Amino acid sequence: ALDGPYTPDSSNLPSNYWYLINPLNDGVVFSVTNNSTFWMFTYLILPNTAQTNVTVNVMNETVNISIDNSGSTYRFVDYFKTSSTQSYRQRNYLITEHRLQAYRRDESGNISNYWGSSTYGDLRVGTYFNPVLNAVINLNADFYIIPDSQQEKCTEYIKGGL
Ligand SMILES: CC(=O)N[C@H]1[C@H](O[C@H]2[C@@H](O)[C@@H](CO)O[C@@H](O[C@H]3[C@H](O)[C@@H](O)[C@H](O)O[C@@H]3CO)[C@@H]2O)O[C@H](CO)[C@@H](O)[C@@H]1O[C@@H]1O[C@H](CO)[C@H](O)[C@H](O)[C@H]1O
């Protein structure tokens, strides 16, 4: 149906596709930096994860972050900073039954992904207005590719699983 799966890869990805990651493992599943004003990664957290300080190696830095997930399903949590020496801070999250999240970089270089919760009723695509034109995107997960004209198909997978 879908093009894929492909093994984990880093590349300066094009803008006319959604990248549907299907991470086998928790932890860092996605990252991108422009090396100057924006660093972003997504951490997949298991259900019933009490608040924990964890050390992670991401985009060539060893950093410490807080993670938590008191829910009964998976939680993909976005972390960002806007300068080299800042600490990472949490942004949006996706609550989901499935090991699936999806990313797209728009033509202005902004990262979009899925936020919210299908079960709660506020699942949405949200865009972080922090351009990273030509930045290498690290997909730390097996993934599939979906043409940008087919966002509804991507949403279907995010909601329902593969
Ligand atoms: C107020 C509300 O709707 N709370 C929801 C909660 O919704 C948040 C999530 O969608 C997260 C995902 O990242 O985004 C939050 O909105 C962000 C927005 O995306 C940012 O751009 C903006 O800068 O900040 C806002 C605020 O941080 C949403 O607010 O999602 C949870 C989990 O599904 C819901 O349970 C929660 O609903 C509330 O649940 C409460 C008890 O658990 C109460 O029932 C309350 O009445 C519900 O509204």
Author numbering: 64 to 225
What text appears in the publication on this structure?
Although structurally conserved with a galectin-like fold, sequence-wise VP8* is the least conserved among RV structural proteins contributing to a phylogeny consisting of 37 [P] genotypes9. Our crystallographic analyses provide the structural basis to explain the unique glycan specificity exhibited by a neonate-specific bovine-human reassortant RV strain and its parental bovine strain, each belonging to the P genotype. We have shown that P VP8* exhibits a novel glycan-binding site that adapts to a differential recognition of precursor glycans, which are the core elements of HBGA and human/bovine milk glycans.
To investigate how P HRV VP8* can also bind to Galβ-GlcNAc motif with β1,3 linkage, we determined the structure of P HRV VP8* in complex with LNT to a resolution of 1.5 Å. The non-reducing terminal Galβ1,3-GlcNAc of LNT, because of the shift, makes a new set of hydrophobic interactions involving I158, S180 and Y183. Comparison of the unliganded and LNT-bound P VP8* structures also showed that ligand binding induces significant changes. The R154 side chain that pairs with the aromatic side chain of F143 via a cation–π interaction in the unliganded structure, upon LNT binding, swings around to interact with the Gal3 residue, through a water-mediated hydrogen bond, and the side chain of F143 rotates accordingly to maintain the cation–π interaction. The side chain of S180 that hydrogen bonds with the main chain NH of Y183 in the unliganded structure reorients upon LNT binding to interact with the GlcNAc moiety through a water-mediated hydrogen bond interaction. A significant change that is observed in the LNT-bound structure is with respect to Y183 in the J-K loop. The side chain of Y183 is rotated to create a hydrophobic pocket to stabilize the terminal Galβ1,3-GlcNAc of LNT.
